[PDB]
Amino acid sequence: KVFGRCELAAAMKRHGLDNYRGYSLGNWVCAAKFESNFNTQATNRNTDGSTDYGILQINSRWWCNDGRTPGSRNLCNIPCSALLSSDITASVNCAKKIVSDGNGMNAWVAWRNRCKGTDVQAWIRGCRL
């Protein structure tokens, strides 16, 4: 599923991400835009052999099991394929664990390089929330 901007903002709000660990909703929409272009089915392989999955590009090196990342962890206790669903619940619940692990949203490279320090409120402007 390719979400629209305001559609995704509303879904992320319903699932508790607005101001989660102090990160306003626009931060999460901006991260999703540049990680996946709002596409739940996005995958990207990494140099070390791990793979990033879903709307927030969660990494199999630590957070999910894909059966092909030897020596990795599965800290969200899910198959990585669950992160590609049109229902974003699994991605949101895993992202909550990631953002709580000490480094905040800096875990998302695209957030650090393209959202951090910008006017992220623009990403939810005009949306009925």
Contacting Cl ion within 19-58 (CB under 5 A): 24-26
Q: Which is nearer to Na ion, 77 or 121 (CB)?
A: 77
Per the residue annotation, which of 52, 66, 87, 119 is the catalytic one?
A: 52
Say if CB 80 and CB 66 are below 8 A apart: yes
**Tokens standing for residue 37:** 């272009």
101 annotated binding-site participant: yes
Strands 58-59 and 43-45: unpaired
Name the residues that contact Na ion, by CB under 5 A. 60, 65, 69, 72, 74
Contacting Cl ion within 57-86 (CB under 5 A): 69
Angle, CA 61 vertex, CA 56 and CA 66 arms, to 5°: 80
Q: Is 91 in the site for Cl ion (CB under 5 A)?
A: no
Burial status of residue 101 (CB atoms within 10 A of its CB: 0-12, 13-18, 19 or more):
exposed
Is 7 one of the catalytic residues?
no
Binding site for Cl ion (CB under 5 A): 5, 24-26, 69, 87, 104, 121
